[PDB]
Design a binder for these strands. Sequence first.
DNA 1: CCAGATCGTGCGACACACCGGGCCAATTGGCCGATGCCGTCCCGCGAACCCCTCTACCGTGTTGAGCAGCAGCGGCCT
Length: 48
Amino acid sequence: APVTHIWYFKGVPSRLGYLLDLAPKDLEKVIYFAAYMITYVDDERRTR
DNA sequence: CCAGATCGTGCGACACACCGGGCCAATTGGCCGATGCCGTCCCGCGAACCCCTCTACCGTGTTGAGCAGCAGCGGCCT
């Protein structure tokens, strides 16, 4: 299974957080299997 | 003065100088040929060597200092 690099996750400032605009707590929750993340949504289909 | 050392000279011996002959001793050193023991290998069996599998009373919780970013809150502004 894929894993993350600790240098680009933990070190302040959280580079992943800055790039994706995620607070470090949310990122830590996601990567360490504590909450889901929505990675795709079909806006036009649901609106129709 | 004059007689032996030194040297001249002479006669002989002569130890080889030659450069050429004519045979030989010692001493071979090869493996010739024949005989014999060891290295390698191909099984043969067996001791051990490692891996996998299953057992059903039941049983249910682990210092100080320096610098920077984030969360909560007081208080405008709409």
